[PDB]
Amino acid sequence: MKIVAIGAIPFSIPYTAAEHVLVRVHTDDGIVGVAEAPPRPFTYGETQTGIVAVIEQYFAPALIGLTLTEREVAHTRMARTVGNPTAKAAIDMAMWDALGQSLRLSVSEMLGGYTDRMRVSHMLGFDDPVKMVAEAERIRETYGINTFKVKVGRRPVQLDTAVVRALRERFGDAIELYVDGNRGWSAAESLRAMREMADLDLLFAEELCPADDVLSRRRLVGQLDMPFIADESVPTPADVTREVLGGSATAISIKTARTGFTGSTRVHHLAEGLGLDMVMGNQIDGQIGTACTVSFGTAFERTSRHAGELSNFLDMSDDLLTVPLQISDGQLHRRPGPGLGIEIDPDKLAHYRTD
Amino acid sequence: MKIVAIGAIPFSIPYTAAEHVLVRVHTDDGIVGVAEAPPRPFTYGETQTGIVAVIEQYFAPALIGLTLTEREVAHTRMARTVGNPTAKAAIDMAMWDALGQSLRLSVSEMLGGYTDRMRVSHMLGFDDPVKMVAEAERIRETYGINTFKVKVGRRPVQLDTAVVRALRERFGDAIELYVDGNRGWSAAESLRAMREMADLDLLFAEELCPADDVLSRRRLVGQLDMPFIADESVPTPADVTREVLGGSATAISIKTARTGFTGSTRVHHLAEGLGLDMVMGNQIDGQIGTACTVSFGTAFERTSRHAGELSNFLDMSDDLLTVPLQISDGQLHRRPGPGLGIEIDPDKLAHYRTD
Ligand SMILES: [Mg+2]
Ligand SMILES: [Mg+2]
Q: Where does Mg(2+) bind (chains A, B) (predicted)?
């Protein structure tokens, strides 16, 4: 189980576009672990070109020679390089995939195996209330999804509060609802919006305003009833500690795209120890990334007690798996096979790769 | 004064190697502003390949068309992309260079023009005390430098405290001394080292331990007499606020390599308003970057009241300027010419570029 090579292949798939990087960890046993790295310059500052570069130029040469059971050595070596979250996460998850295949165990069970499935949430917004209601009905009827996260951040705030209210009026208590502003509103606008929706039983408020508007962010978080999920502002455990102790976050988003499995376990244990809720998020992941999210989320009780953002891949026109993921009865099961339980379709990769 | 093009040229110059990126902002007036971006994967996570990529693929197309007097528009647009500090800083400084050339004004005077020169500090360490003393004598006698920053972080700590003590015994109060651990020591080791050197009158303690060892870092900072300079942990104003209010920093390093001139002004004003000392740092800069550091540092009283890390370029085997920078009587003057007061030697660029 020694790493003999690590590759990074850029690929592009149009949306109904995902310009991700397929990361592959090759072992001396002929096993190949895989994962994807989604470049999000507006969240982490990584680019597709940059991810391939850091992996080929820095991470690959630093990890070749290590066994699949020296994860902490790999973790420590990669940690020397600052940032480049998805690049590091992809390598970690590909290593875990390879390990699982080598031991004939799923990543989920190796991580803890608490359960075998997660409830799925769907995100929507930035359109008319009538259209949003129509989409929610379609998604719920088609996939059984009962949890919806409304993307907000428009001005006037009434444009978004109208969407959330329309959804609650249509489904009543039959669905779960919460919001994510992606730092789009000011703290003051965020408070006015939440106050207007005080009767809609929103379970969480996610990154309504910039965490970097430090003092106003802290004031807002202290004014809200529900937990305030920090996402882009807590990419590392140290950020979790600073934002939580500082009062700018009262809940934590865990995204395997940025913290993989080794790092995500560090985030889960920190959040559990501190006593904070956690939710599995989506980095606008393809099916490879989604398979990773469910692999981790199902391993623990604290992550599986909440729905996970696992439906974004449906918006892609195609994907790289030989067997596509399926959402039924509003849930997604962790794959039955060893490792991530997935396989890359050779023809799909050949058709979508851009190198 | 409209930007018509922005280029990023990778180059490499061996040390007596600097793999930086020359950034050039072209205007419709035929003026070309310049600056460099030093890729520091172990500090910011940027790579030489990554810097060129983010500039060519994201920043250049987003800035072409803006005038040199729409700095806040450029600042806001670049801010959409997370991280990539030196890439952004280089573009900002090149824009300022172009503006200065267009108005026949030096960057220093446009920024405030408080003074015309800065005292220079030199960093050394990681060798035997006798050799370190010899180097300090040489540097002081050769350039007149009277401020030395000892790089520390080795174990046992006695190896570094011995170096600092040897320097103080040799020069007495004739020189200024302080230390920078580059996050190399644990907080506990850092305290023991500083206590051992309590009689050596160190003016500052810089990043002795990781800022990410959050609680122990805060405890250490509160135990030390002198100001504790945060550097790699405060790359943005928001980090300055979080680290300062959290107690993990009691002084601020300003490096034009990561915050340029527009961003550095934001850091200076924040630090001045909060009431914290600030020091101009070095990102292992070449002469282009050093010219930028002095341009900014001389503009304000709070930055010029302390020596600036401005001697690292001396370790390079060559550089790209037509007229090299000169340190005399332990000081460096801001260039007399418009903009940064520098010009790229065509033959040097042709010989060292790697594209
Ligand atoms: Mg989010
Ligand atoms: Mg430093």
A: 180, 206, 231
